[PDB]
From Swiss-Prot:
The gene is CCP1. It comes from Saccharomyces cerevisiae (strain ATCC 204508 / S288c). This is Cytochrome c peroxidase, mitochondrial. The keyword Ubl conjugation does not apply. One of its GO terms (cellular component) is mitochondrial intermembrane space. Its EC number is 1.11.1.5. The chain holds residues 68 to 361 of 361 of the full protein. Binds 1 heme b (iron(II)-protoporphyrin IX) group per subunit.
């Protein structure tokens, strides 16, 4: 019988809020310093994509994958064609992991995404420690991450495996306001908007205000390009092709606060999928930004 395995969270021995706040600051200080990466966009978006890819492998049916084991450090998940380009985010976190060797890989990978969102004027995201590194045999096989060449029916059915409903799915997809698609990484080229390193509801505004047309890129893939220079993945554009997705898209495009709150809950839920938190485990941490600390 394949009963769901239980990944009990174990706080790192003798570590509290102040210990993980220093990790947040080490990540945040390096974000403002290494600001020339990828045409001065910064390492922000790739750290958000890292934390999502290390969590998106989760399977709710047998509790395999997820952010608990930090198995992205192993060669099988590291060389995922879906994870192309995430090596830049890993190398970004290597000097920080050497400075804080006590933190686990899963905790560092997920906290990197939380830090990037908050340091890019995004909402506060409650974060929790306790992820424990698991052996290499626990690394999930390739193919668990979604394809960008699909429609709304695929997006809804894929995220059901991550225990995510429609409103929660539209919220997480709003993180595509950050960064761009790299043709050498995924076969798509172009950013979604103008504010590449500022967390905003711009992803929804461009989906409704721009005149999109299906075009073919240099990688023979087809994507939706606008005359302003923005692009949308077929999975992105399906958020307005689906009527249920569309009403949530218009809701977020009209209310940035409603989008920030829904993303903060959905992103933490994504980073905590598959982890059993005991009763003696501490409450989620709300990390102060560098601006709130005067740093
Ligand atoms: C069906 C769901 C999704 C699909 C198919 C998808 C697909 C993609 C693809 C193909 C790229 C291009 C990466 C590159 O070429 O470098 C990308 C980038 C990105 N994705 Fe997604 N994604 C999905 C969901 C998400 C979620 C849930 C998040 C965050 C919570 C997210 C955040 C990002 C970010 C920040 C980037 C920018 C990466 C960079 O600038 O280096 N995406 N996505
Ligand atoms: O993001 O796949």
């Amino acid at each position: 019988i394949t009963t769901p395995l239980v990944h009990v969270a174990s706080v790192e021995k003798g570590r509290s809020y102040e210990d993980f706040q220093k990790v947040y600051n080490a990540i945040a200080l390096k974000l403002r310093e290494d600001d020339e990466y990828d045409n001065y966009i910064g390492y922000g978006p790739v750290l958000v994509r890292l934390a999502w890819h290390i969590s998106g492998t989760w399977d709710k049916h047998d509790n395999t994958g997820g952010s608990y084991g930090g198995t992205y450090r192993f060669k099988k998940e590291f060389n995922d064609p879906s994870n192309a380009g995430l090596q830049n985010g890993f190398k970004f976190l290597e000097p920080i992991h050497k400075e804080f060797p006590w933190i686990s890989s899963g905790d560092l990978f997920s906290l990197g995404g939380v830090t990037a969102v908050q340091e890019m004027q995004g909402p506060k995201i409650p974060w929790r420690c306790g992820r424990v590194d698991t052996p290499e045999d626990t690394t999930p096989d390739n193919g668990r991450l979604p394809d960008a060449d699909k429609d709304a029916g695929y997006v809804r059915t894929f995220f059901q495996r991550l225990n995510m409903n429609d409103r929660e799915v539209v919220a997480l997809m709003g993180a595509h306001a950050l960064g761009k698609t790299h043709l050498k990484n995924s076969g798509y080229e172009g950013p979604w908007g103008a504010a590449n390193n500022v967390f905003t509801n711009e992803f929804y505004l461009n989906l409704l205000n721009e005149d999109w047309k299906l075009e073919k890129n240099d990688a023979n893939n087809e994507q939706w390009d606008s005359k302003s220079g923005y692009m949308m993945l077929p999975t992105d554009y399906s958020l307005i092709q689906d009527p249920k997705y569309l009403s949530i898209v218009k809701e977020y495009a009209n209310d940035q606060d409603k989008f920030f709150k829904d993303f903060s809950k959905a992103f933490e839920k994504l980073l905590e999928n598959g982890i059993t938190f005991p009763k003696d485990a501490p409450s989620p941490f709300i990390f102060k930004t560098l601006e709130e600390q005067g740093l």
